[PDB]
Design a protein around this ligand. Structure first.
Ligand SMILES: [Mg+2]
Length: 421
RNA sequence: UACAAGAGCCUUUCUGUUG
RNA sequence: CAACAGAAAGGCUCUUGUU
């Protein structure tokens, strides 16, 4: 198709070097973070068993991550003040509350986990809706034997979960939408599993709060079992809008809406409500308040040895209907096996986002993914909506819209924190 | 669950042919 | 009611070296 040029990532620090992505992945060595915030207090925790991951292994991992963060322009000064052992979801509460009420100004908690466990669910719920700080989790097997890319992606997640900026992108190469303070919002619905007629559905929304699209702000509300539409989009979009006004000190001119977790057969079903609900968020805030709203939908539905499609390939024929918009685009290159990256579609939009500018923006947000040094399948706000919806699945563990709604409400300084990376 | 797709199995949901 | 499907959403179980 049309392999779009990856933007120049502006790594900061003293060198202010640029890590240009090659084949979808960029190196992190000799590159320092743009707004790598100094780590004064931080805590590591061992929920993995001692027989598998040991204290020497954890100390070596901590030392190597600190040394690769010094190369990343992210000073983690001194040994971590907390390193203890615990296991179970019931042991999540006292340790996490201690880490809340012992280190003033603490911004991130780090835990290690063996595998698929509800302890991950409990720490995510306690961090994002009960206590109010970002939580970082890393698998057992990736702490024992640390590749440099492991520590690089981990340290990007650490830096973005503190509240700093990993790397802003090319300002002269950024799309002109950044010429005004603008917002990017993502939404995702994760339905209850089949055979269960009482679990509530999930309505998760994320939205930016900075000029460079590195800092976001999210919340989620429950709704009717397997409800495709978003129940209360006005309330949480208004919350994100007032958070944006607090943060950037300017009202948005353009807002962008990414849709995820929606089947192809009911797109209009989630349009006519939700866009209007966005208007219900915008009219009810200020008088004569009418910014432009775009509605595009994302679905995770040659290069290397595997011969996967290159990132950014454009094709508008032989897959979908000749009529309708049906703007068939993808912005990711596979690694091994087969390539089924993602599927972005434009309904009509209103901000007059041109195709090249919107494709530049979604590729930039794919590079603005703050969890790895790679261009990825779905954009950053779509990923944040997906993972915040996942966190909502971890918020109703052993718990319409009632108690459920109040068990998924994001804590007051957790919207301004990037708990979801 | 550093990230990233891939592959195997079970639902239970929605659109087709037939019924 | 059943059958040949395609798509969505969960749960599991295996691999890659992307520095
Ligand atoms: Mg989902």
């Amino acid at each position: 198709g049309r392999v779009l040029q990856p933007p120049s990532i502006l790594y900061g620090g003293r060198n202010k070097a640029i890590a240009t992505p090659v084949q979808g992945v960029w190196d992190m060595r000799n590159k320092q973070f743009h707004t790598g915030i100094e780590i004064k207090v931080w805590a590591i925790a061992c929920f993995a068993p001692q027989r598998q991951c040991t204290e020497v292994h954890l100390k070596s991992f901590t030392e190597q991550l600190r040394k690769i963060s010094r190369d990343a322009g992210m000073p983690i000064q001194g040994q971590p003040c907390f390193c203890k052992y615990a296991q179970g979801a019931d042991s999540v509460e006292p340790m996490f509350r201690h880490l809340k009420n012992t280190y003033a100004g603490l911004q991130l908690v780090v835990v290690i986990l063996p595998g698929k466990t509800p302890v991950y669910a409990e720490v995510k719920r306690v961090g994002d809706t009960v206590l109010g700080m970002a939580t970082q989790c890393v698998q057992m097997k990736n702490v024992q034997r640390t590749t440099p890319q492991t520590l690089s992606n981990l340290c990007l997640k650490i830096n973005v979960k503190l509240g700093g900026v990993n790397n802003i992108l090319l300002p002269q190469g950024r799309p002109p939408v950044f010429q005004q303070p603008v917002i990017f919002l993502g939404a995702d619905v994760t339905h209850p599993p089949a055979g269960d007629g009482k679990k509530p559905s999930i309505a998760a929304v994320v939205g930016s709060m900075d000029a460079h699209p590195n800092r976001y702000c999210a919340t989620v509300r429950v709704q009717q079992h397997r409800q495709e539409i978003i129940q209360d989009l006005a309330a949480m979009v208004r919350e994100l809008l007032i958070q944006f006004y607090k943060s950037t000190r300017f009202k948005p001119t353009r807002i962008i809406f990414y849709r995820a977790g929606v089947s192809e057969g009911q797109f209009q079903q989630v349009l006519h409500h939700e866009l209007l609900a966005i208007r219900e968020a915008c009219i009810k805030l200020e008088k004569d308040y009418q910014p432009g709203i775009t509605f595009i939908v994302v679905q995770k539905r040659r290069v290397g040895k595997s011969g996967n499609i290159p990132a950014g390939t454009t094709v508008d024929t032989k897959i979908t209907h000749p009529t309708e918009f049906d703007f068939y685009l993808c912005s990711h290159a596979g690694i091994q096996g087969t390539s089924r990256p993602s599927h972005y579609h434009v309904l009509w939009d209103d901000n007059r986002f041109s195709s090249d500018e919107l494709q530049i923006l979604t590729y930039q947000l794919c590079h603005t993914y703050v969890r790895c040094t790679r261009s990825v399948s779905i954009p950053a706000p779509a990923y944040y909506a997906h993972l915040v919806a996942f966190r909502a699945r971890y918020h109703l563990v052993d718990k319409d819209h009632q108690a459920l709604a109040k068990a998924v409400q994001v804590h007051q300084d957790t919207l301004r924190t990037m708990y979801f990376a």
